UniProtKB/Swiss-Prot annotation:
Disulfide topology: C24-C82, C38-C92, C56-C107, C63-C70
Positions bound to dUMP: H16, K39, N42, T43, H124, R127
Regulation: induction: Up-regulated in response to the cytokines IL1B, IFNG and TNF. Strongly up-regulated in response to the bacterium P.aeruginosa. Moderately up-regulated in response to S.aureus, E.coli and S.pyogenes. Up-regulated in kidney in response to infection.
Organism of this sequence: Homo sapiens
Outcome of mutating K39A: Loss of catalytic activity. No effect on bactericidal activity
One term under GO cellular component: extracellular space
Record protein name field: Ribonuclease 7
Keyword terms of this UniProt record: Antibiotic, Antimicrobial, Disulfide bond, Endonuclease, Glycoprotein, Hydrolase, Nuclease, Secreted, Signal
Physiological role: Exhibits a potent RNase activity. Has broad-spectrum antimicrobial activity against many pathogenic microorganisms including uropathogenic E.coli (UPEC), and remarkably potent activity (lethal dose of 90% < 30 nM) against a vancomycin resistant Enterococcus faecium. Causes loss of bacterial membrane integrity. Probably contributes to urinary tract sterility. Bactericidal activity is independent of RNase activity.
Family note: Belongs to the pancreatic ribonuclease family.
Tissue-specificity statement: Expressed in collecting ducts in kidney, and in apical uroepithelium in bladder (at protein level). Expressed in various epithelial tissues including skin, respiratory tract, genito-urinary tract and, at a low level, in the gut. Expressed in liver, kidney, skeletal muscle and heart.
Domain of life: Eukaryota
Residues at the site labelled Critical for catalytic activity: K39
Subcellular location: Secreted
């Protein structure tokens, strides 16, 4: 789970930002280190953060929860889905699936001491098209 006191924007970066692609089994170790149990599924976006925060500028659309703070990407990007196939921590073994799809992020204003560069930042990944 997201550590107490960490912002949602910062968590989003840890969980999903992977500008240079990494193998799932390596990359999922840093996702799995807070619970030290194997996360079942995770998607990594192979884009610079600034390009994902730029998506917060597209027209507002409904998230999966019904709230109108989601935003679709301008275009498809490279991303990797990781899916747990076996193991127990620290042996979380994943099957990867590399894809080129658009995505939808939920966005909110930055909080606390988040950077001031972006007036809306991604706080969670809402869907992959
Ligand atoms: Cl997240
Ligand atoms: Cl951390
Ligand atoms: Cl940590
Ligand atoms: Cl995910
Ligand atoms: Cl990043
Ligand atoms: Cl949602
Ligand atoms: Cl709400
Ligand atoms: Cl293509
Ligand atoms: Cl998420
Ligand atoms: Cl969601
Ligand atoms: Cl989805
Ligand atoms: Zn940590
Ligand atoms: Zn709401
Ligand atoms: Zn997430
Ligand atoms: Zn959502």
């Amino acid at each position: 789970m997201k550590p107490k006191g960490m912002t949602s924007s910062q968590w989003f970066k840890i969980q999903h930002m992977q500008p240079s692609p990494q193998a799932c089994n390596s990359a999922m170790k840093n996702i799995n280190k807070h619970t030290k149990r194997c996360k079942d599924l995770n998607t990594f976006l192979h884009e610079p953060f600034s390009s994902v925060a730029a998506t917060c500028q597209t027209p507002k659309i409904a998230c999966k929860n019904g709230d109108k703070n989601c935003h679709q990407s301008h275009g498809a990007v490279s991303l990797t889905m990781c899916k747990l196939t076996s193991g127990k921590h620290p042996n979380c073994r994943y099957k990867e699936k590399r894809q080129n799809k658009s995505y939808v992020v939920a966005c909110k204003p930055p909080q606390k001491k988040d950077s001031q560069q972006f007036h809306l930042v991604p706080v969670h990944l809402d869907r992959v098209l």
